[PDB]
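User: My notes are a mess, but here's the protein and zinc ion's SMILES. Can you give me a structure?
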Amino acid sequence: GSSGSSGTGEKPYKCHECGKVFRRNSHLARHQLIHTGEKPSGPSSG
Ligand SMILES: [Zn+2]
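Assistant: No problem, the inputs look usable. Here's the predicted complex:
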């Protein structure tokens, strides 16, 4: 229950797959592609 914030602060995401840290979340999203590849949204035949 520790208190005390450093203003706006920050919360950089860290890839648990390899251990690479990223500034924002989006940066990590594209990185995840190297690990997982699930692109359901976007039919080809249909
Ligand atoms: Zn990674």
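The chain has one helix and two strands.
User: Great, I'll file this with my notes.
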